[PDB]
């Protein structure tokens, strides 16, 4: 209600490492700036059985949400529900105990291939009345068949108002900043006109550490590439809209254009890194990539011969998630996107200068934010199908590369790859 | 019958690494030399839930079946399902997808100590009723005592004609060639009354490669030299039977005349390549064997004094796999264990001279000819009982030996060894 | 002279690796910013046989100093001159050609075990006359007994004024800032009395650098803990004097009061990375550590009981040296060691607050700095005899347990260990 | 004429490991193939001092010439003459020896900073007449600068035909295939007009060994790529000329036209083998290849664009020495440059055709045809000292990418490197 939120919202996978890392904390950022109504209940659900007094204690060994400033207050707020998302009779149950007059959101913090199943236990069970909501998360598949499958099987219990398509990327400020400059500043207008390279990257130091089950059938080029980084290229290759809501057609235009590669060789790096095969529950034999790097072009007039670089690995060296747009080999604006961040690079006669605009955080994090928009049915910052296709269509191209071993798996030390070194084929 | 296979294969393992170099490939030969009805299954089976379409992708892109000429139909027989075999309730899972009107084979492509347990949750699920037939990889057990046990708990459910015991040495033409060239040629009769040395060797230039976990309970001895190099030892001195119905009976009695070392240090040599210990899954304080080398000796009156030379091991600079027979210091008769070839050496005045065979590979490798003879129920080419246990009596004797460092591990560069200056020792 | 200086220095580990990452580069530095006399000479030496051109060749692409603004023009004041191992006639013609009309340098970046011989090839060719300077590396010796003969052989044929111990560490700026800021700021004064808990801490990501032979003799405790670190603790606790010229005194003092372990194992955590065994010219059952973690006490009533961790290792997976000065658990002031920076962190409500400076470094180096004061004959930022003998006390009391496996010799995986974890122990 | 050889040879260095293993056993050869007159005279030479009987002695016991099948007979030509090279009084002695109109032929087995010295005491003491030859070994400079000055130097006492540059390459069986097959087959004359690719490719299993001391001051590209591989190219490329005493000018003619890179990244791969640096007497921070990959160019017309793959390297998995030529993409003449044979390689719709010619034989060996030539007074197989420089001209602008580290020295792990995927950067 704007402030005092009063609503339910029942997570699914609360005992993974999403649930821990950033969507409770997400949920006390909320509760801290906008309040909870007394009744608003958050319901944490996994396949274990455990008692509210044991999920609180996992929950405060894993996130320090006890020692927080409304730490008591909050956790006040959070069950326990345990749901195997296999026998409907787990979600009658549930049924007997979901309100019917304020909005209840169920969070699908698990794997796709669970999607469609768990919706249908929710709608077998009188779980999907209008006061419903889904938050499905960002892969929604595997490939574009099994992205249609998910769509055609929930809208058949779920009408649209209902399917809330999260990718946090569209939540971050320094993905919104690419097109707010672009809008309001006719020196970009004019110069995005002459772009010679895209470089869009995300590395990371951790590695997966058994997540594995669901990351060795994903991999890196579907966990990130296929989702977070396309949405970034979709916003700097767009047209600007004559009305911002008017913007998903644009961007799915440019979707759209995405072409495949012409050679594989040249344009697809793929590696895993030494000891993944190590982490629990991956396969021994496992072919699945930890490192991603793509040259890919787009057939529109405006970037005709440009390419945009898509990086995205883990156990990396540094932790980076940036997009360099270059104009002419010396010349490049850069934006941050873990950092509220603006660059420019200048060279004088000897080195570079680069200029720079830095602010603190806004407190809210991505993932919260979104939440929010959640509670308040606002889908203006939430991922559409037909975009998501269109990322597919591109991403099976090079997943069938990958399967007719067309590059092949390399290996790479943790935290100690030669990025430069290790993709010059891609530069040359 | 011949063609047209009627039959359900469920392969344990099959994510493993004997499963996809040689086995799948093995069943496509099978599959485009004979045909399968277009209802025969093979259901792979491995611990992890993954989907039919994730495992053929795994299978896919590891062995580029897909790619050949009838290669999607064959595909189209396979698919996956999850057994863990800890679990007894995924046993009841199986078995609602077992045949009861066909050959129905289960191949245990898994690491000894899971014979026994997986027998016995077939045969507390009735999955051993007469159409079925069991194939057991190579090590049967780590003793003698293990492959005791291990056969007397299997044949209280099984019958002998159910259980295969499979030496894919047995379905090589150059190790088949020994015993038919002994048996059609006069000559080898009266050349094995001097022969003055053997050499069997088998070398790899790969190493443990993700199988450490099983590989460091096991070790180069019983790897290979317990059943395969032993196999062909017993090929070379098996007396010829009278009537062939004798043959499994003196290789018995041969294996039976294998001699304990006199002295370990000066006959047998073991070694560990630099390296291993960082293995995934494999011990730092490990005194496993991947190098073994051993002068052996047999009490029969036709070998009285007669070195046999048994050498295996892995990551060496070149891969070898031959039976050297030296009859004196010039002549000597090489089987090719690899190749359909064979040579025999003689010298003129001046040079020396190679007599030699070529004959090119034959359409079926050996495991899909066994896995044929499988499907026909033919024990011909299989390993039986009392051959592994006289086998099992002489490396017994050896591994004991390297419990109490009789001889030291020594270490080696990865594809450096000097194997000649390492084993001069050996020979003298 | 402080510009155009005039002088000869013979560099004996020339072609090792300090010289080609720090020496050469640091006497270019000097030229560049100080110039030098035409017939100023720095003569490379080492054991290899090398001509002035093949010498040049190998420093110029290890270096690349010959495409720097004034990269020629410095090279021709460089040459190479072979002297082997204790080699009378190489030692011989190096004293036909040193000049006895200006300042005469060697430069001993060779490794301890070498210098009193060295030193005694000098001075038994008249190569210790008054124009001559000895430049000894930073481990001297590798025990109190070592430290103490190095010194009394030298000191038989060079006056002490001759002598000259390198811890470039005391050329760093932001080493330097703590003994400045603690001399200009009472606040320090005050504050130094509540210190809870020192940490001084040098992770590198490299590793041995093919210095095997070096590295296994010596290993990270005497490497950089001998003294770097203790260098940076002593500067931490020194009694400021009233007169700076017993600021030597003072420091001998506090480094007497360090405490050998109250108990080894919960004090004392040592490691070793994988495939250091592997290394060239190291012992494949080697017991040197890469890795040091201490949790030393000092005797004075100042810090009675309050802990300095001293942190220092290899193959880590990032770089870092720092020391850290806590006053309580929330308020911590942090000297960077290789940036000039320094950081207070105080606390808000709820929030943490960082106050910070940053200045850009130097132009000249730590090793050019010292470099230029040998040049000038200033021995005010050189190590001292005796600090270096308190330190090896101490030092040689945790080099008795290494020996005695006080402790265990833990491995930990090249660049990807965590730190946190491994030491918790260490910080209870 | 052809055949009772009427010459003198004093053989310089006649103790050296080049005299021991190869130049004595070719000329046996040569006598038994085409005799010698009775006194024709064999001088083996050094600076130490010996009486027949005793060098005789020494010479068989290395080479067991006298237990050969005309043993003593060829050693009846052999004698001692002790010449120090730098006394012109033992010069003079050896003038009464030279008979003066026959050829006398002078062979330098001996370091090359002598040769002007005893080329000086040759015409100092009348020894360098017409019917005088001078036989010099493969390493002449180690850039254009200093082969200039050797054949300057040298030039003075001896005419250019009086010189035979030895590239035992040229002497290479396989080698000389090369334009036999150019010269009598029209069909080449056809399709060397339309070669799309050419490999020359010379890969080794051994490492330095021993050799250390000089092989790092040379490393791969100057050790064989500047005169073998260059040579063969030479070959492959040259016009055929209408007289083959115009060979060597052609040969100059093309090797002029050999391009810098224009692009060092794609065009040059250099790298050292691990533990190369360990060999003794190597510098422990040695920037010398082991491995080199450079793909040429030439700027004439039959060939403009046309890329010449040279390929060299040690430590390698494989042997190998050969030519391919490649015509498309799919057709391939190959020869081999140490068996003769000859290799077309064909495509039908499946499977690749190899057409072959073997013959297994002995024509002579490499010196033993070159000694023969030198004694016949052909140039033809010697190298001309203007191909050394033009040769010289492109290797030194790659030595002086080398020292900009223009492109990257990797490092391999030795008989492990995977070469397809290492030149991938090349080929793409």
Redesign the interface.
């Given at each position: 209600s704007e402030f005092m939120l009063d609503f339910d919202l029942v997570l699914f996978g609360a005992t993974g490492d999403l649930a821990m890392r950033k969507l409770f904390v997400s949920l006390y950022e909320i509760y801290t700036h906008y309040g909870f109504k007394k009744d608003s209940k958050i319901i944490a659900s996994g396949r274990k059985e455990l008692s509210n007094e044991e999920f609180l204690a996992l929950l405060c060994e894993k996130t320090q949400l006890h020692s927080r400033?409304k730490g008591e207050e909050f956790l006040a707020h959070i069950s326990y529900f345990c749901v195997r998302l296999d026998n409907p009779k787990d979600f009658e149950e549930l049924s007997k105990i979901a309100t019917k007059n304020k909005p209840l959101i169920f969070y699908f913090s698990i794997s796709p291939?669970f999607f469609t199943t768990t919706a249908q236990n929710l709608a077998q069970n009188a779980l999907n009345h209008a006061n419903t909501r889904l938050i499905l998360e960002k892969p929604l598949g595997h490939d574009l068949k099994t992205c249609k499958e998910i769509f055609q099987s929930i809208s058949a219990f779920f009408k649209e108002e209902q399917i809330f398509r999260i990718d946090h990327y569209l939540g971050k400020k320094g993905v919104q900043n690419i097109l707010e400059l672009r809008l309001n500043n006719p020196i970009l207008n004019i110069l995005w006109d002459q772009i010679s390279a895209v470089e869009i990257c995300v590395y990371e130091?951790l590695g997966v550490e058994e997540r594995g089950?669901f990351y060795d059938?994903i991999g890196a080029l579907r966990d990130m590439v296929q989702n977070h980084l396309l949405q970034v290229l979709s916003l700097i290759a767009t047209d600007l809209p004559d009305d911002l809501k008017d913007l998903r057609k644009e961007k799915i235009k440019v979707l759209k254009t995405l072409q495949p590669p012409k050679?594989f060789?040249?344009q697809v790096i793929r590696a895993q890194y030494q000891?993944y095969?190590?982490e629990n529950?991956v396969?021994?034999?496992?072919?699945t990539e930890t490192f991603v790097a793509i040259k890919a072009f787009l057939d529109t007039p405006k970037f005709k011969g440009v390419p945009f670089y898509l990086k995205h690995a883990k156990?990396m060296?540094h932790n980076q998630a940036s997009v360099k747009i270059h104009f002419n080999a010396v010349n490049t604006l850069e934006f941050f996107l873990s950092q509220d961040k603006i660059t420019l690079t200048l060279k004088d006669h000897q080195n570079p200068l680069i200029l720079e605009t830095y602010n603190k955080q806004e407190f809210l994090q991505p993932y919260a934010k979104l939440l929010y928009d959640a509670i308040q049915n606002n889908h203006n910052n939430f991922a559409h199908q037909l975009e998501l296709e269109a990322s597919w269509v591109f991403i099976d191209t090079l997943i069938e590369g990958?399967?007719?071993?067309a590059t092949?798996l390399y290996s790479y030390?943790?935290?100690?790859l030669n990025e430069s070194?290790f993709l010059?084929?891609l530069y040359?």
């Open positions: 400033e291939s130091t089950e059938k050679n060789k040249k000891g095969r190590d529950k396969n021994k034999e496992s072919q156990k060296p990958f399967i007719n071993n092949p030390e943790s935290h100690n070194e010059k084929p040359q």
